[PDB]
Amino acid sequence: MIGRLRGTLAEKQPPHLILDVNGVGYEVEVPMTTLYRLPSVGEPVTLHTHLVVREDAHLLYGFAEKRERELFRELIRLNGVGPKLALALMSGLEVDELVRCVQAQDTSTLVKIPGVGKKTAERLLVELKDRFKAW
Amino acid sequence: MIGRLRGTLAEKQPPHLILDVNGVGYEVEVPMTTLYRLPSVGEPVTLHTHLVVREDAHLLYGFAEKRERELFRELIRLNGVGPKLALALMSGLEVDELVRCVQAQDTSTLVKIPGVGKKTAERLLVELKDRFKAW
Amino acid sequence: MIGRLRGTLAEKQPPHLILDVNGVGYEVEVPMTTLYRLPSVGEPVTLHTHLVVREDAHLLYGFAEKRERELFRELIRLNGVGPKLALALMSGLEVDELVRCVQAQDTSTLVKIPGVGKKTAERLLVELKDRFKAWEVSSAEADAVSALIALGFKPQEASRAVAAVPGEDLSSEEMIRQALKGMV
Amino acid sequence: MIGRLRGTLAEKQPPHLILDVNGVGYEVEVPMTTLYRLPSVGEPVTLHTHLVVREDAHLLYGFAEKRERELFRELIRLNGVGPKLALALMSGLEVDELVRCVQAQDTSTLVKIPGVGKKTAERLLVELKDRFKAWENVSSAEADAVSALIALGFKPQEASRAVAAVPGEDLSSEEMIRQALKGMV
Amino acid sequence: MIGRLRGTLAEKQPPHLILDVNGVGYEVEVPMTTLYRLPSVGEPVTLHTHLVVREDAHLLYGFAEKRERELFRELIRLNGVGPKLALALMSGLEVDELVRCVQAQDTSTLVKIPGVGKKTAERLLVELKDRFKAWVSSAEADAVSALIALGFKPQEASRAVAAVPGEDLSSEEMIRQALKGMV
Amino acid sequence: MIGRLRGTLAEKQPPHLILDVNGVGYEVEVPMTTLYRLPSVGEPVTLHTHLVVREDAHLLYGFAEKRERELFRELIRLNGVGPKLALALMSGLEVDELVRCVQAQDTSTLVKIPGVGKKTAERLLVELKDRFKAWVSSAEADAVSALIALGFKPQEASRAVAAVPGEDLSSEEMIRQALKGMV
Amino acid sequence: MIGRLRGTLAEKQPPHLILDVNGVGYEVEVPMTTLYRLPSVGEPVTLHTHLVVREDAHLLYGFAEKRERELFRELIRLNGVGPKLALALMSGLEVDELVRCVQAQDTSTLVKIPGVGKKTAERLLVELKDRFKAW
DNA sequence: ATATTATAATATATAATAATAAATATTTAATATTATAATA
DNA sequence: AAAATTAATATTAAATATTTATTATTATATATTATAATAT
DNA sequence: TATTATAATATTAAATATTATATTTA
DNA sequence: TAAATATAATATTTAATATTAATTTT
């Protein structure tokens, strides 16, 4: 329903974020790696946003790039894992090292990422064995 | 509920599109026939869209014409047809071709669409026979 | 969640509307009485709106006044009344006409509206009689109370004496006499 | 979905509001405490709205600053608290008042607010003292002692933790109850 | 629905019990305290029961006492209490002792129950505080009326009247025995 | 699914009961009049039970007569009527005067039932007049008023008046025999 | 809600059954293995049953053993496993063979069970390696 | 012969308790994960 | 013309248990009303 | 220096039947 | 060329009743 957002930075209150667009501010959830990429408060910055919908509320996810957003979608399409373990994973590592790690089939590097044990690490490996291309 | 959408094409990625309407770029997917009528990235393009509201998702489907959106509404009103079957019908063939073949009670022109079997074709024709006395 | 729009009428068709707000045109359905008051396509129009929120599909329904939207919210809060039933209702009759018909318990005026049967009139009257009363202990008794206070009665005893009998259509002097003759 | 609206107050009808942003008005409800500082109609205001998603309706709940925004979302996060409850709480009194009362644990300040009874008051006290408000935003002798305290005006909690703090072991009742009476001072 | 079972025990796999009532076994669990009162395999047993209906499951809970069922039901009516919590509580401590601790509102005796947080303890104690109640013949009616005229409440008089003296005794002696009590 | 049960009354606490139907006991909530016409605990009886199902609970409400069960059915069929309202109205009064007051369009008869507002009863009139297609004296109040003005407490005076009313005799003589009660 | 059913075989239409217990004959779904352990029609027999409850239907799945019921419970307690899937699982081959296969990570033998792909088989292997925990 | 006022009753403003009806709020069960206290 | 019947046909949506201001109704001193004799 | 039961917390949640149609193997 | 088998994709309310139009008889 929503794919991208282009507005000025209303404030910076991590890990939440408000983007004032046409005077309208949106609550978005942002990775720490993207927090290293954000400009100053009041800077017009483009965020590629994805929405999740549950029965009592919703959360947006403003992202600075596409392929991170589609990998978010592919991960959250799994029933065993939700969005916030994905947030921990993406705050742990970026796209390319995760791609080689799942292609190398290693749970150990996923273990050091906080909030993740071992069994969910081979969950990520098994489920994402044959989903995507190398880009 | 947006009945018509008029913004600038932020990016092009099949089969979706992102229309940056004054800063906000909606995740909008349109059929390929509209993609033949779609200008390049950055052009102000007007779409007669309609939102599909789900318990866990919301989908926008833009249309360059009002009547194709109306036919999309008629198709999704059918008990077994969702958004993507109607998407296949819109992408495969043209609206006047559909109404002529329904008046002709054709089936082969429908089955030849990929993803369409004899069952869905005979369905759409026989539950659509009653309509189109008004035009 | 939404109260009003300042937009541009991108397209009108019975019975919906398209209001191009900053490039975004919303599907807004309006009654025929509102449709008569609307200017042409491309004119900014004043619609005070309410969204009907259902799991599978929403409904944007706007009105030229706050009062129409508020009364529609009252009608949709009712038990067996749906939205387009009430849309037919104010398409048929206006706010003053409906309010006065409710206060007069009228049915014949409103049964000309299509979709309205006898049970429709029953439910609308039974709800709207007590949902709203005003739409946008007597002077002789007080004089009697003061006169009996001057006569030596306590205010409580004077109130009890004047409330003992329901004096009707009688002057202040004679109602005191009939109340005083009443219990004795 | 909504956090802030750089727009103008299109209408002011208590307790609701219409806040116009680029011609788009929204049905917004705010507490009376906000309504005291809200400027005139048409003036560009500062008000942090909050969306609540239901299967049947949606409403917007504005707030002047971040502190009462966070207070509201955390109060609604409780199992027993609805929107109008926190709206009445903020309309009655301010964030500093409620936090300084909760750390003082007096229900009397809470219960004078209309729609707020006793049970809601100990719910607020207990479930806020349950880790949110550090930062600004027996034997025969002991049973005999407890029964004597109940008969002498003591509510059971002060008769309980006094026994717990200084329990009596293998000695007569009169002296550990005596030092417990010195203990509660 | 289900209020009580009078059936025959089929197998014992604690805490899950199967009760073959006329050919059909019933999936019911009992607390370990009730494990200390179950009969052997094949022996009939009468269990006071009450069901729980979930969105995707139906769960059956059966106790030795009706009052235990009522206390369990009132625990389930609490907003933060699930069946696992109530089974942990009653597997820790028995019913009237927990009632008196609710009168005490003490967390020390309930924290020791495994898997139970202190915050859970005070919230359940506060929302379970005592709003509930604490746990005729010619001579009977004559005594009840006499003590009503003497100022005693009818419910207060009846429990002193019907307890100590027998059935159909002399009115004078049974009124005497009813008024033998002191507080 | 279920319409009738024929078992043995294992336990009867108001307003419910336990009917042990072939080894299985059901908690069935029945009205006050039904409880009045039920036999003792342990006596077999057949009951016109109505199936009640919620997404997270299920109940039964049994009757000694079928027409009670169908009338309960169309009462619950109304959106604005819950089970407690129907149970209260049928516990307070009998069904024949209910259908006659529906025909007579009477409200104050229904209002005196506890938990019944004027709007609730008047609505019940509104839908029941279309649902149903085929299917004390002046001296009594005078004595009460005279006793109230004399000095008697209003409710015990009415108790004395209604204990032995003057249905077949004059007001002065029924006052004379009503003053027997409090002596 | 029913863990054991001592009834009489009224009807034999595989893989469904009717156990007329005191005049009441429920639908009883059994695997083909239990069908080999099943006696003839009219023979009283005890089945150890399990309940599945969803919003539109209830079904009975009666087994010859406790351990069969418990294993079926723990397979349906998985996220991506349906009832007919596990039905085909114990219909294909025996329980202790399944335990040996998952302890030996034998995806090949589990593949030869009909209706089971390689992906589903290795899912079963990885989510059942440690769940048995050698009893 | 008028008040007056020194002793005598009195009646209710202010404490309390007991239904009650409009107005809401409406989810826990299972399981990883991570501390964490205690431990060969 | 004039009421009764029936087949489509669009429409509508299901809420209970609790809870707190909001009304009842029950004492309790205390600032009032009162009288009597009494000088002047 | 690992190692394990316990507890608080913080997530995540729950679809499955029915066709259309790829390779594949005769 | 004819299916087999996963494989993936795609899809997924109901009763129940009140109004109304055409018909039918008087």
Distance separating alpha carbons of residues A57 and D76, to the nearest angstrom: 13
Whether the Cβ atoms of residue E135 and residue E170 lie closer than 8 Å to each other: no
**3-state SS, residue C158:** helix
Residue B8: what are its φ and ψ, rounded to 5°?
Answer: -95, 140
Experimental method: cryo-EM
Question: DSSP code of C56?
Answer: S
Write the single-letter amino acid at G124: L
8 A C-beta contact, residue F122 and residue C129: no
**What's B31's DSSP letter?**
-
Residue A118 CB closer than 7 angstroms to strand H? Answer: yes
Show residues of chain C in contact with B5, CB under 8 Å. Answer: 23-25
Q: Write the single-letter amino acid at E173.
A: E
Distance E177 CA to H31 C1' (A): 62
Q: What is d(CA G38, CA E165) in angstroms, rounded to the nearest whole number?
A: 64
CA of F78 to C1' of I11 (A): 17
Closest-CA residue to D76 (of D89, D91, D92, D57): D89
Which residues 27-56 on D are within 7 A of strand H at the CB atom? 54
Q: Do D5 and A27 touch (CB under 8 A)?
A: no
Nucleotides on chain I within 7 angstroms of protein Cβ: 11-22
From C67, C84, C80, select the one nearest C16 (Cα to Cα): C84
DSSP-H helix ranges across chain C:
32-37, 66-76, 83-92, 95-103, 118-131, 139-150, 155-164, 172-183
Query: Of the candidates A26, A81, A73, A33, which has an alpha carbon nearest to the alpha carbon of residue A52?
Result: A73
Cβ <8 Å between B24 and A6: yes
Interchain contact E126–D (C-beta under 8 A): yes
Note if the bond before G15 is cis, omega within 30 degrees.
Answer: yes
CA distances from C156 to C146, C149, C161, C172 (A): 11, 9, 9, 19
G19 CB burial (10 A radius; 0-12, 13-18, 19+):
buried
As given in the structure block, the two tokens for residue A112 are 């050091």
DSSP H helical ranges for E39-130: 66-77, 83-92, 95-104, 108-111, 118-128
Q: Do residues E61 and E51 lie in contact, with contact meaning Cβ atoms separated by under 8 Å?
A: yes
Characterize the bridge pairing of strands D2-5 and F44-48.
unpaired
For the CA atoms of G99, G104, G109, G111, the dihedral, rounded to the nearest 10 degrees, stands at 90
Neighbours of F131 (CB within 10 A): 15
Q: Chain E contact for G1, CB < 8 A? A: yes
CA C102 to chain centre: 8
State how beta strands F18-21 and F24-27 pair: antiparallel
Q: Which two tokens stand for residue E74?
A: 């009132």
Report the Cα–Cα distance between both ends of chain D, in Å, rounded. 53
Q: Which nucleotide is nearest to D120 (CA to C1')?
A: I19
- Cβ neighbours of C123 in F, within 8 Å: 126
- Distance CA(G94)–CA(G71), nearest Å, equals 12
| C-alpha to C-alpha distances, C162 to B130, C140, C156, nearest whole angstrom | 75, 10, 10
| Nucleotide with smallest C1' distance to residue B115 CA | J20
Q: Which nucleotides of K are covered by protein (CB under 7 A)?
A: 5-13, 16-21
For the record, the structure tokens of C170 come out as 């009688």
User: Which has the closest alpha carbon to D81: D48, D135, D125, D35?
Assistant: D125
With CA atoms as reference, report the closest residue to A49 among A35, A63, A65, A36: A63
CA distance E150 to E147: 5
Say whether E18 and G6 touch across the interface (CB within 8 A): no
Q: Answer yes or no: are the C-beta atoms of A9 and A20 closer than 8 Å.
A: yes
In G, which residues are within 8 Å of A81 by CB distance?
none
* Side-chain-side CA neighbours of residue E136 (13 Å): 15
Residue B112 CA to J20 C1' — how many Å? 11
For residue B24, give the nearest of D146, D142, F76, A22 by alpha carbon.
A22
How far G118 CA lies from chain A's nearest CA (Å)? 12
Instruction: Report yes or no: F86 and F29 within 8 Å, Cβ to Cβ.
Output: no
Provide the β-strand partners of residue E21.
E24
d(CA D171, CA D145): 13
Query: Which residues touch D7 (CB under 8 Å, ≥6 apart)?
Result: A23, A24, D19, D20, D21, D22, D24, D44, D45
C77: Cβ under 7 Å from strand I?
no
3-class secondary structure, B30: coil
- Name the DSSP class of F113: S
Contact C6 D18 (CB under 8 A): no
Instruction: Name which of C66, C78, C132, C72 is nearest D16 in CA terms.
Output: C66
* Contact with chain D for residue E14, Cβ under 8 A: no
Question: What residues contact residue G83 under an 8 Å CB cut-off, 6+ apart?
Answer: G52, G59, G61, G76
Q: State how far the Cα of B7 lies from the Cα of D93, in Å rounded to an integer.
A: 46
Any chain E CB within 8 A of the CB of D127? yes
* Spatial CA neighbour of D64 closest among D82, D78, D81, D46: D46
Tokens of A120: 């969910």
Pull the structure tokens for residue A113.
Answer: 């990422």
Gap between the Cα atoms of C164 and C160, Å rounded: 6
Report how far Cα A134 is from the mean position of its chain's Cα atoms.
19
Give buried/exposed letters for C61-77 (b at 16+ CB in 10 A, else e): bbbbeeebbebbeebbe
Tokens (6 digits) for A29: 């959830």
| Contacts of residue F27, Cβ cutoff 8 Å, sequence gap at least 6 | E1, E2, E3, E4, E50, F16, F17, F18, F60
Q: What angle do the packed helices A66-76 and A83-92 form, to 10 degrees?
A: 140
CB count, 10 Å around CB of E70? Answer: 15
Which are the contacts of D48, defined by CB distance < 8 A and separation ≥ 6? Answer: D3, D4, D62, D63, D64, D65, D66, D69
Query: Which residue on chain C is closest to F149 by alpha carbon?
Result: C183
Torsion of CA G63, G67, G71, G72, to 10 degrees: 10
Q: What DSSP assignment string belongs to A25-93? A: EEEEE--HHHHTT---TT-EEEEEEEEEE-SS-EEEEEESSHHHHHHHHHHHTSTT--HHHHHHHHHH-
Cis amide leading into A15 (omega within 30) = yes
Look at strands A44-53 and A4-11 and give their pairing. antiparallel
Protein CA F159 to sugar C1' I25 (Å): 20
d(CA E175, CA E172): 5
Residue G8 CB neighbours (<10 A): 16
| D80 contact to strand I (CB, 7 A limit) | no
Q: Which residues pair with G47 in a beta bridge?
A: G5
- Answer whether A23 sits within 8 Å of D7, measured CB to CB: yes
Strand J lies under 7 A from the Cβ of residue A86: yes
Q: How far apart, in whole angstroms, are the C-alpha atoms of residue C45 and residue C32?
A: 15
Question: What is d(CA F78, CA F65) in angstroms, rounded to the nearest whole number?
Answer: 21
Closest CA to D1 of A59, C3, C54: A59
Nearest Cα to Cα of residue D127 among E120, C30, B65: E120
Contacts of C145 (CB under 8 A, 6+ apart): C155, C158, C159, C162
Answer yes or no: are the C-beta atoms of F181 and F160 closer than 8 Å: yes
Those nucleotides of strand H lying less than 7 Å from any protein Cβ are: 12, 21-35
Tell me if B45 sits within 8 A of B65, measured CB to CB: no
- What Å distances lie between residue E85 and D127, E72, F57, CA to CA? 19, 10, 20
State how far the Cα of E59 lies from the Cα of E46, in Å rounded to an integer. Answer: 18
F115 touches strand H (CB under 7 A): yes
Peptide bond into D156 cis (omega under 30): no
* Torsion angles phi and psi, residue E37, rounded to 5: -130, 5
Element (H, E) at D10: strand D7-13
Three-class DSSP category at F47: strand
Point out which residues pair with B26 in neighbouring strands: B19
Report the neighbours of E using a cutoff of 3 or more CB pairs below 8 angstroms.
D, F, G
Cβ-based neighbours of B99, under 8 Å, separated by 6 or more: B132, B135
Please tell me which of the candidates F18, F22, F58 has its beta carbon nearest to residue E3. F18
Phi, psi of D34 (to 5 degrees): -65, -40
CA F160 and chain centroid, separation: 24
| G99 token code pair | 């335990």
Q: Is A7 helix (H, G, I), strand (E, B) or coil?
A: strand
Measured CA to CA, the distance from residue A103 to residue A106 in angstroms comes to: 8
Measure the CA angle with vertex A123, ends A89 and A2; round to 5°: 50
Cα nearest neighbour of E2 on chain F: F26
Judge contact between C24 and D42, C-beta under 8 A: no
Which chain B residues are Cβ-neighbours of A67 within 8 angstroms?
none
- Which has the closest alpha carbon to F38: F10, F74, F70, F77? F10
Other Cβ atoms closer than 10 A to A43: 10
Identify the sign of the CA torsion C109, C113, C119, C123.
Answer: negative
First CA to last CA across chain A, in angstroms? Answer: 25
Find which of D6, D9, D22, D72 to mutate to test the A interface (most A CBs within 10 Å of its CB): D6
How far the first Cα of chain E sits from its last, in Å, is: 43
d(CA E11, CA E34): 15
Q: For strand J, which nucleotides have at least one atom less than 7 Å from a protein CB?
A: 6-17, 19-22
| β-sheet with D58-61: strand ranges across | D44-45, D7-13, D16-20, D27-29, D58-61, D51-53
Interface test with F, best of E2, E4, E24, E50 (most F CBs within 10 A): E4
Contact B122, B102 (CB under 8 A): no
The burial of B47, by beta-carbon neighbours within 10 Å (0-12 exposed, 13-18 middle, 19 or more buried), is given as buried
3-state secondary structure of G43: coil
Task: List Cα–Cα distances, A76 to A125, A128, B83, in angstroms.
Answer: 14, 12, 22
List the one residue out of A19, A131, A16 whose CA is nearest residue A76.
Answer: A131
- The three-point CA angle G103-G106-G109 to 5° equals 130
Contact D60, D76 (CB under 8 A): no
User: What is the token pair recorded at F168?
Assistant: 């077949």
List Cβ<8 Å contacts ≥24 apart for E119-128: E119/D130, E119/D131, E120/E80, E120/E85, E122/D126, E123/D126, E123/D127, E123/D130, E123/E80, E124/E75, E124/E78, E124/E80, E124/E81, E125/E101, E126/D122, E126/D126, E127/D123, E127/E78, E127/E79, E128/E74, E128/E75, E128/E78, E128/E102
DSSP run (H or E) holding B58? strand B58-61
Core vs surface per residue F4-41: b (16+ CB within 10 A) or e: ebebbbbbbeebbbbbbbebbbbbbbbbebbbeebeee
Max Cα–Cα distance, chain E, nearest Å: 63
- Residue E55: its chain F contacts at CB < 8 A? 55-56
Pairing assessment for the beta strands F50-53 and C24-29 based on DSSP bridges: unpaired
* Nucleotide closest to residue A54 (CA–C1'): J13
Task: Determine the Cα–Cα distance for residues G27 and G20; give it in Å rounded to an integer.
Answer: 9
Stated as kind and residue range, the H or E segment containing C28 is strand C24-29
Q: Quick check: D83 CB within 7 A of strand H?
A: yes
Query: What would the two tokens of residue G109 be?
Result: 């033998």
Q: Which two tokens stand for residue B132?
A: 């189109």
Q: CB within 8 A of F142, min separation 6: which ones?
A: F171
All partners of chain D with 3 or more CB pairs under 8 angstroms: A, C, E
* Chain D residues close to A13, C-beta within 8 Å: 66
Q: Which of D79, D146, D164 sits opposite E80 (nearest CB)?
A: D79
Q: Are F48 and F3 in contact (CB under 8 A)?
A: yes
The CA distance from F89 to F87, in Å, is: 6
As a whole number of angstroms, the distance between CA G81 and CA D107 comes to 52
Per the CB < 8 A criterion, the answer to whether E143 and E175 are in contact is yes
Cβ-Cβ contacts under 8 Å for E24 (sequence gap 6 or more): G2, G4, G5, G6, G7, G21
Question: Structure tokens of G67?
Answer: 């351990």
Instruction: Please state at what angle helix C83-92 crosses helix C95-103, rounded to 10 degrees.
Output: 100
Give the max Cα distance, chain B. Answer: 47
Residue whose structure tokens are 């995707």: E56
